[PDB]
Structure formats: C-alpha cells, structure tokens
Amino acid sequence: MSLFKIRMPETVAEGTRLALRAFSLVVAVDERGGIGDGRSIPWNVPEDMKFFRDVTTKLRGKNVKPSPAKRNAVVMGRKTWDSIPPKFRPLPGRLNVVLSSTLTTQHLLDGLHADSIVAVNGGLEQALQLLASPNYTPSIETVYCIGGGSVYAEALRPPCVHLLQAIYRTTIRASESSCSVFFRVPESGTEAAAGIEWQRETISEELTSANGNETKYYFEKLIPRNREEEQYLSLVDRIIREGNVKHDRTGVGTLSIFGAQMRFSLRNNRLPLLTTKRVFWRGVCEELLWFLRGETYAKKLSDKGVHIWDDNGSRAFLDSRGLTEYEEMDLGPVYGFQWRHFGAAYTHHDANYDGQGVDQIKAIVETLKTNPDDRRMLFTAWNPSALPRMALPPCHLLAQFYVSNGELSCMLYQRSCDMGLGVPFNIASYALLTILIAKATGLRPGELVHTLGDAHVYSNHVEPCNEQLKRVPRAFPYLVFRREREFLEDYEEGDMEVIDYAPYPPI
Amino acid sequence: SLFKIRMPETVAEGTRLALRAFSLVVAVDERGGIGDGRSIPWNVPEDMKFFRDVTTKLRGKNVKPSPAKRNAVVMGRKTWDSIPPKFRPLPGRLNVVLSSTLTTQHLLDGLPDEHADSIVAVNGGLEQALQLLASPNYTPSIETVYCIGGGSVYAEALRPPCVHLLQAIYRTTIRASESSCSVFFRVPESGTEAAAGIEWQRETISEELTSANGNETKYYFEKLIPRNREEEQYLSLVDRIIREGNVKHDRTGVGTLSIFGAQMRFSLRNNRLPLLTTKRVFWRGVCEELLWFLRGETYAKKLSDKGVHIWDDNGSRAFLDSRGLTEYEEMDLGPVYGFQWRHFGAAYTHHDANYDGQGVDQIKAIVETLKTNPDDRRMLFTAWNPSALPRMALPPCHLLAQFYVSNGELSCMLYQRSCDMGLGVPFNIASYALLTILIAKATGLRPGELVHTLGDAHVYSNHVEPCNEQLKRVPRAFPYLVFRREREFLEDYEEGDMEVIDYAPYPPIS
Ligand SMILES: NC(=O)c1ccc[n+]([C@@H]2O[C@H](COP(=O)([O-])OP(=O)(O)OC[C@H]3O[C@@H](n4cnc5c(N)ncnc54)[C@H](OP(=O)(O)O)[C@@H]3O)[C@@H](O)[C@H]2O)c1
Numbered sequence A: 001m002s003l004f005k006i007r008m009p010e011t012v013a014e015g016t017r018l019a020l021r022a023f024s025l026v027v028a029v030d031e032r033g034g035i036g037d038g039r040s041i042p043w044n045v046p047e048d049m050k051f052f053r054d055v056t057t058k059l060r061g062k063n064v065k066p067s068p069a070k071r072n073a074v075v076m077g078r079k080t081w082d083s084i085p086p087k088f089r090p091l092p093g094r095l096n097v098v099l100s101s102t103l104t105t106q107h108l109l110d111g112l113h114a115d116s117i118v119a120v121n122g123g124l125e126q127a128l129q130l131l132a133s134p135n136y137t138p139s140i141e142t143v144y145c146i147g148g149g150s151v152y153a154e155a156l157r158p159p160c161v162h163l164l165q166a167i168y169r170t171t172i173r174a175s176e177s178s179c180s181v182f183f184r185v186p187e188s189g190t191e192a193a194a195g196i197e198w199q200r201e202t203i204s205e206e207l208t209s210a211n212g213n214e215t216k217y218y219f220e221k222l223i224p225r226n227r228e229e230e231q232y233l234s235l236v237d238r239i240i241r242e243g244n245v246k247h248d249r250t251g252v253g254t255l256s257i258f259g260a261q262m263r264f265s266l267r268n269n270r271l272p273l274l275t276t277k278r279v280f281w282r283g284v285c286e287e288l289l290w291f292l293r294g295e296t297y298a299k300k301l302s303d304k305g306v307h308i309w310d311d312n313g314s315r316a317f318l319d320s321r322g323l324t325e326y327e328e329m330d331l332g333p334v335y336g337f338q339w340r341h342f343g344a345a346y347t348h349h350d351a352n353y354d355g356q357g358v359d360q361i362k363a364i365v366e367t368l369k370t371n372p373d374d375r376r377m378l379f380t381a382w383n384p385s386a387l388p389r390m391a392l393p394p395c396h397l398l399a400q401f402y403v404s405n406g407e408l409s410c411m412l413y414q415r416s417c418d419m420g421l422g423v424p425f426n427i428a429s430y431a432l433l434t435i436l437i438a439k440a441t442g443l444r445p446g447e448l449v450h451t452l453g454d455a456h457v458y459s460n461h462v463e464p465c466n467e468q469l470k471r472v473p474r475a476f477p478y479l480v481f482r483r484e485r486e487f488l489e490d491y492e493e494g495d496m497e498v499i500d501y502a503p504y505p506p507i
Numbered sequence B: 001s002l003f004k005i006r007m008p009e010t011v012a013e014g015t016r017l018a019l020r021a022f023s024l025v026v027a028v029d030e031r032g033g034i035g036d037g038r039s040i041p042w043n044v045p046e047d048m049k050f051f052r053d054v055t056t057k058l059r060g061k062n063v064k065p066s067p068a069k070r071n072a073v074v075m076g077r078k079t080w081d082s083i084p085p086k087f088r089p090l091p092g093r094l095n096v097v098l099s100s101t102l103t104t105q106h107l108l109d110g111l112p113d114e115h116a117d118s119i120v121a122v123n124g125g126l127e128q129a130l131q132l133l134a135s136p137n138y139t140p141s142i143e144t145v146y147c148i149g150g151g152s153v154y155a156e157a158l159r160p161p162c163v164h165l166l167q168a169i170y171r172t173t174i175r176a177s178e179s180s181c182s183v184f185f186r187v188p189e190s191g192t193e194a195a196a197g198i199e200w201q202r203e204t205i206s207e208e209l210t211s212a213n214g215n216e217t218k219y220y221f222e223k224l225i226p227r228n229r230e231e232e233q234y235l236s237l238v239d240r241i242i243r244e245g246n247v248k249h250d251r252t253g254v255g256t257l258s259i260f261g262a263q264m265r266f267s268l269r270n271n272r273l274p275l276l277t278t279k280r281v282f283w284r285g286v287c288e289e290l291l292w293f294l295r296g297e298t299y300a301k302k303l304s305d306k307g308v309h310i311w312d313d314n315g316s317r318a319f320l321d322s323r324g325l326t327e328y329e330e331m332d333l334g335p336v337y338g339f340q341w342r343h344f345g346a347a348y349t350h351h352d353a354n355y356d357g358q359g360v361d362q363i364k365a366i367v368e369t370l371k372t373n374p375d376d377r378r379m380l381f382t383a384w385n386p387s388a389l390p391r392m393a394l395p396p397c398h399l400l401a402q403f404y405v406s407n408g409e410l411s412c413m414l415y416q417r418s419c420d421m422g423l424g425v426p427f428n429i430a431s432y433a434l435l436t437i438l439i440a441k442a443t444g445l446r447p448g449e450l451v452h453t454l455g456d457a458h459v460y461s462n463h464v465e466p467c468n469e470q471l472k473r474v475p476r477a478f479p480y481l482v483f484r485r486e487r488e489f490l491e492d493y494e495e496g497d498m499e500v501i502d503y504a505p506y507p508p509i510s
C-alpha cells in the first residue's frame, strides 16, 4: 500500500521556507522618546539594566539553563556593541548577533573560548533571515532586537515590522537636548503603523531609581493587536451574553448561538494557535496526521500520549453506541476513513482498505495541481450511511478549497462547535491541513475560513471563559518544517516545529 | 403513498393571519399637527392633488382604476365624516372605513342620492383591515393599500404589529403654524425608542413650493421609507466583490470577479419571504423546483412541462453523453439533489424506477427529530455524495443544510460551494426560505432565520456593468408567503397552494 499515497512535489520546502524569524524588541527611552546621542546611553538606571538582562536571558519553561541547545538571541547594531565595555561582552546566557559591514565574526573575537557571537554583513532583515535557518530555528527560543537607532528604525517598518511580536519599553523620566537618535511607536491607523495597531498589554507603576538622582521610570509591554483571535473572543462573549440555553445528549447545560464565520491568515508561516489559552498542539498535529492517513484505530494516538479519543474508544462507550463488535479503540469509519475511503464498507480497523471508496484528499490534490479554478474541490465526512457505524458523528464535517494568486485558501464547515476546547483545536487542525495540502500541490498557504453551526459554551465554563475574555490576544506563532517527506502520509509530528508560541498562563 | 411525510393537524402555536403591506399618506404642519379632531385647519389644493394622485394611480402605463385592479384607502370613521357627503366615496379607490358603530350599509346611506359598492366598513382597527385586504377576495383586485388615516389610525400604523408592514410614508409639510391642531403625527427618527427598531430614511424630498391658495403658504413633499438592512447586506457583498474580488475563470473560460467565504442572514418570521427587490426573482421557478426536490424527483421533464426550463441544457442528449451518462434518457438527471435528500446512497438506475424505502430519508429523519428533540445538533441533510457524484448531471451547488430550534422557531443554515450573485444566489435564498417555511409547518414550529454560507461567491465579468446600475437602487420591503390551502402530506404541496403577497420588485436593468 504505497501507490495509493500522495506524492509530494519537488517544490515542497519552498512552499513553507521561513523568510524571516519573528522577534521582540527591547528599548529604553526618555519622555521625548530619545534613545541616545548615537555614541553612548545618557542616563544611568540600574533597574533598567536588571530588567533588560532578565527579559533577554530567561526562557519560557521554568528554571531552564540557557545553552547552545536552547537559548535566546540578541541582535544589535555595531555601534551598540562598541558602547558595551569589552569586559561585559559578549552578553552571557544569550547569542550575540552583531550587524556590521566592516567587522567579521573572527574580528569581534579580537577584542577583550566558547561560541556566542556571529557577525552579519547586513541589516536586521539579514539577521532575521539567518536566524530563520535550521541552525538557529528552533534552537534559538526568542530573538530580541536590543537595537541602536538604525536597527530599531529597520524593525519598525516593513518587511521586519510584520515579524515584530512584542515591545518591551522602559521610559526614563528625564529630558535633554543631548538626545539625537529617537524611538517612536507608530500610532494606530497611521501610515507609519503599516496597518499594525499597538496595544498596551501591561504598564508598571512609576518606580524610583536608586541611582542617587531619584529618577522616575516605568516599564510597558506593547503588543500588535490580534483581531483574528478577537473574532473568537467576541463570539464567546456574544454567546454568554445573548446565547440560548440548550442541553446536549447527556443533559449538560449549554449556551448556544447559530451561524457564524471567522477568518485566519496562514500567510508567511503564520499559525492561528490561540494565545489567551494554550492549545494542545502536539495532539492537534498527531490527530490530523492520523486523519490524513485514513486511520480509525484510536490506540495509535493513545500510544503517542494523545488521549483525546480515549473516552470515545472505550468498551463502555462503544457498547452504548451499539457497536458491540468493535475492538476497543476501533472507532468505526470516522473522519479520516471518509476522507480517504468515502463510502467504503467498513469491517474492522486492521483490515485493508487500499483503493476502496472515494479518495477525496487525493482527488483534491490532483485537481489543485491541474485546474486551480475548480469549484468542486471539497471533501466531507458526513456520510448518512456510515453514520450509525461511527463511534461519533463528525463535527468538522466538510471543507472546501480555493486558489487565488498561487495561494490556497480553505473553508471548514463545523456543525457543532465547543468554543472552549473544540473550536481552538479545530482552528489549528485545519490550519495544518491547509498548510500540508498547499505543500502537496506547490502552492502557498492563504486563509482559513471557519464556518460555525451551533456554536456553544458550556454552562459551567462561563465563569472560566469570563476571565479569559479579559485577556488581550497576543501575536500568533509560526510553523516551520524540520524536514520534508516523500509521501504526504509519511509526515510525523517531529517533522514540524511551532515557534514563538507565547500563550498566557491558565486561569 | 405513506412513504410520505404527514403534515401536522394544527397551525404552529403563535402563528398569525396574513397582513397586507401598506403605505401611509399624511399632511402635517411643522409642529406635527394633522387636524383639530374634526377637520384640516389649512387650505392647500396642491396637497389635495398629490393625495388624489398617489392613492389613485396604479403601476401600469395608463391603467384606469377598475374594480378588477385598483388601490384601497383605509380611514378612521371621523376622517370619513370630515369628507363632505357629496364626495364619498373617493373615486377609483376601495374605501375602507374603520368603525364599531357604522356598518357598510350604514355608510352608503348618508350619501346624497347615488352604484357605490366601493365601500366596506371594518369593525376593528388597521390590523383587521390589513387582514381583510389579504383575503383571496381582495389580493387580485387590490394593488396598493394606503393609510389615509385619522390620528388614531396613524397611531396604530406606527406601532407593532402594523408598523412592520409599512412600506413607505408620503408626508406633506405645510409651513403654517396653527395653535389649533390638537391631533399630531411624528415620524420616529432612526435609533430612537419610538422607531422600535426601524430605520427611517428620506428617499426623496421636493423643493419648497408655494401654494396658489392666495396666502403664499409654503409647503413640500417627502417620501420616507424603512431601510431594508438585509438586501443592503446582499448588495454590500456584491459591491465588495466588484471592488475587491479576484479575476477568475469558470469551466467554459468566462471571466468572473470572486471572493471566498461570506455569510448572510434573512428573517423568515411570520413567513417573510426574502425575494430580492432590486432585481426580480423568478419565484414560480423557485417554488416548482423545490417541491420537485422535496419529492426526490430526478426527471427534469417534470419541471420543463410546468414551463420551468432551468434544467434544460443539463438534461439534453448531448450534455448527458458528455458527462458519460449514455444510459439516462433525455431529462433524466441522475441521483441529484432531491434524490440524495430522500434516498441518500440508494443505487440509481432510472428516473421512473421505484425507490421507496431505499437509501436514507434525510428529510423524514430531520422532521422526526425536530418534533421530538429540537436541541439536537445532527439535524442536517447533504446532497454531496462522492459515490453518487459521477452519476449525476451536475454536482450539487447548494449541498448542505443544518436546522436549529430556538424560541419555538426553526432556523436553517445553507452551505453553497459556488455562488453566482446575479442569478444563482437570490434564487437559492428563496429556495431555502420556502424549505424552512415548509419544514416549520411540517414539524409545528414557526419560521425563524435563514443563514446563508457562500463558498466561492462571484459576479460575472460581463454582468459587472448591470450590477453597478442595480447597486444604485434602493431596496424595497420583502414580501410574504401565504398558504391559501393545506395538504395532508408535505410532498403533496403544489405551487398553486401558496401566494406571495406584496412582491413589487424593480423593472429589469437596461
Ligand atoms: N537607549 C537604548 O536602549 C539604546 C540601545 C542601543 C543603542 N542605543 C544608542 O543608539 C546609538 C547608536 O545607534 P546608531 O544606529 O548610531 O547605531 P546603531 O545602529 O547601533 O548601530 C549602527 C551600525 O550597525 C551596523 N549596521 C547597521 N545597519 C547596517 C546595515 N544595514 N548594513 C550593514 N551594517 C549595518 C553598521 O556598522 P558598520 O558600518 O561598522 O558595519 C552601522 O553603522 C548609541 O547611543 C546607542 O547607545 C540606545
């Protein structure tokens, strides 16, 4: 069973090669926005120094020692490197990227072992380009632009500004005509803002510096407004406020709304993994691959530590669905089976189903490659005949593809959507699918459009959801591929990496 | 056949007698005063003429008003009394008078000498008169209904239930200020409470005119209409497609501007039928095709014999041969649409074959669930059958519908993969409007909302210029569906059973 698989084309990696790596920015400014004299840093505020070292050294996971394997990177202009006393460079615990057209890597080592320094002949884009390569992605966890006026200037305009994930700004409450170089965040809806709308995530109270001068200062974290996730958050808020009380099969309460639509850009490696509550990506990834393979044995997910189908695959449940002859974890002709073997007679999971039923995924892959204007390019799992033989009816039951300007868009129709767990999971799921299918057809990812039927929140989840509603959505992470694989069905979870995923903690 | 779906015994709890659409005609001073309770305080012959012309004239070329086709005017009894006996009734118009005391026979009598069977008393308010004028007796003859008022009648016209049938307001403003006027009329402004969710807009306004009553009395006319948000919602999509859509090309190689993924909603409440006003929808065709779908039919000759030729090209000997279907006779479309609805997965042979009990009866199951367990989330029927696809004349376009109950109302979602905004879409909106209305009747719920999901929404390149002319048009109100008779079985509904009332769409764009 190898000639029934999808063969990945020669143009597979170029579809999802990361052009630039995402980065955060860290700066100190005065009330006039000045950053320095182009030579040295004017003010002396030890509390900013501590903040700066912390924001740039600390890693996502707790108590993780920075090492070549996993550490942060700081990118800086050459003049900034010079402004640091030779004794204290390179900055410990981090990878020091230096932009210069006159100083090579080895040249930087001449002045003041181990490896923590790279020079780049180019600007911030080139640095982000290099950091996008395998040797740095995903070994480097977070990239920080620690700046220099010209570097900040490059960060705050296209193409780089669209990769800018957070601003960590310290404001020093002092002023002087001694500041030549300036740093200003573009205001919402201005030309300089290039479409971005910077939100304030946090602001500190005014603190006083123990520097002998009694200087005031404060910290702010700015983030680029995530309207896509706000779509979702709005819907949840509308459901709680205006939704109808309903009760599902068990008898559990639910707040419900009917008919809705959301969009998510998949462009430039962008992955719509929700940030206001961490999504279980590993399971998302494992299940989709399990779907694509037309797999119906749930143990294959259970084995890989994904238990999302554990309850629905138990003897207890299968019996309650009258499927008394199914082996435990054999779920019947669900999802993937309909995708790859529509209308094929089902017996047991371990049977051979090669070349049986309709192979919708393959058909679509073939159509996209030859006639991209086709309006019949859609698959479905909603098979009335198969339905009683399934452990569960499909929620996400239909998807349609669309091509424009060499970009693959995809719309998913979901009949019943749990806003709490299902919806975020399925958003990522169909993102991955569209990405993979785009790879298989030599196209770029476009948009994912989500259509909802009965969109619901669980009654007891209202209290938790209300707390999440008060969180400001953060920028989405990115998906990159460690390696490609000859066939579509051969792709493993470890073949792809989600980078710069910084969700909020739970509560 | 009793493989059919048996209709319920009663009308769904909360359902209402069909109400007629009406316009309101009024003359006010600047303070908003209309009369002294007894008479009009001012003398402006130009308003008199405007009133005669607006309430008398019909839509035609030079169509003389006759008992066969004419307008009706509804008035309070006091207003009738204010019109001097020798001018009753108002010529070329059905005179409907509201009174609990006076009867038809009371009204004629009180006339000077002479006949006038153009008078009818109504023992009730404006609601009763709008019900009456919806009778199978009146809907042929009565073309437009005018509320010529009385303070009390205007009051009733401006509140629910009546205000929702108000298609336009013709107001004359007389620039006199009389401290006399004790009766008032105020058009509620958009967003205010008295507007009760209606957004009133000025369609037209005359220049200020001077009356020739020898007092230089200033006056002016204006037409006020309620905003049709839902057709606006459609048109905005069309306009967004033309401005932002990508150039694409269909199977033949024809140019289209298109966008991917959009969603529209329409209210069906009390059998409101979203037939678009800015370009006439071929209702008869919509109706015949749907009942044809519901019955599980696949023989297009059934449709073309009823003078509905939409399936003609797709049913011909030439076309069926090209799709590889050398076995089907002409007009046999294969296991399409209705077949999948009523017999999902059944092996197909020919249109004339017996298919009872075969496949899955998706509609029958949905009807069943709605009646017993309406919070269900699996109440959806699909025509998209990957196995059956190659045996069909065309793959389904509207290919999935989901039902939803809330507040004893049946809502419904329609998924359409390919959407031509000019012809295919407004047709399909009506198709699923009707369906939801029928399924509501079949399960004893009252109609709710139609949600429409569009896949590839497009406009044809050649259709771009005509669309722009249509986009300039102002949407009128949606009509209503009125079932003039009933059936024992859902399948037994003929197109003749239902009447669309007050569908007055625009003429064709050049
Ligand atoms: N307040 C703060 O937080 C903060 C932080 C950092 C810096 N500053 C102040 O900013 C001032 C310096 O900023 P400024 O830009 O003059 O210097 P800044 O950019 O660090 O450094 C500029 C240098 O980086 C290298 N470089 C930059 N862009 C390049 C490109 N496109 N291609 C090749 N090389 C490139 C070039 O050096 P080569 O020609 O030698 O190759 C360029 O001269 C100092 O005051 C610094 O202290 C303030």
Ligand SMILES: NC(=O)c1ccc[n+]([C@@H]2O[C@H](COP(=O)([O-])OP(=O)(O)OC[C@H]3O[C@@H](n4cnc5c(N)ncnc54)[C@H](OP(=O)(O)O)[C@@H]3O)[C@@H](O)[C@H]2O)c1
Residues within 6 Å of the ligand: B025, B026, B027, B028, B033, B034, B035, B036, B037, B038, B039, B040, B041, B075, B076, B077, B078, B079, B080, B082, B098, B099, B100, B101, B102, B122, B123, B124, B125, B126, B148, B149, B150, B151, B152, B153, B183
């Ligand atoms: N400026 C304009 O455009 C304009 C137009 C028309 C009239 N008007 C003014 O309107 C003034 C009078 O109006 P207004 O409201 O007092 O009277 P309006 O209703 O014309 O006349 C009162 C009549 O309404 C009838 N009516 C209303 N609701 C009814 C119901 N539910 N059932 C039975 N009968 C019902 C009553 O009949 P019964 O009491 O017999 O039961 C009553 O006789 C006139 O003086 C005239 O000047 C102005």
Ligand SMILES: COc1cc(NCc2ccc3[nH+]c(N)nc(N)c3c2C)cc(OC)c1OC
Residues within 6 Å of the ligand: A026, A027, A028, A041, A048, A049, A052, A080, A083, A084, A085, A088, A146, A147, A170
């Ligand atoms: C503390 O170690 C040192 C660091 C630096 N770097 C300059 C400097 C200072 C504060 C800063 N604060 C923020 N928020 N962001 C920066 N990018 C930043 C930089 C870039 C300069 C030093 O010499 C003055 C030094 O030794 C004191």
Ligand SMILES: COc1cc(NCc2ccc3[nH+]c(N)nc(N)c3c2C)cc(OC)c1OC
Residues within 6 Å of the ligand: B025, B026, B027, B040, B047, B048, B051, B079, B082, B083, B084, B087, B090, B148, B149, B172
């Ligand atoms: C139609 O002819 C007549 C009508 C009326 N009805 C009062 C009256 C006057 C102006 C009016 N103007 C408008 N815009 N709409 C009306 N409803 C209206 C009415 C209702 C009173 C008459 O006696 C003067 C008369 O004879 C001229």
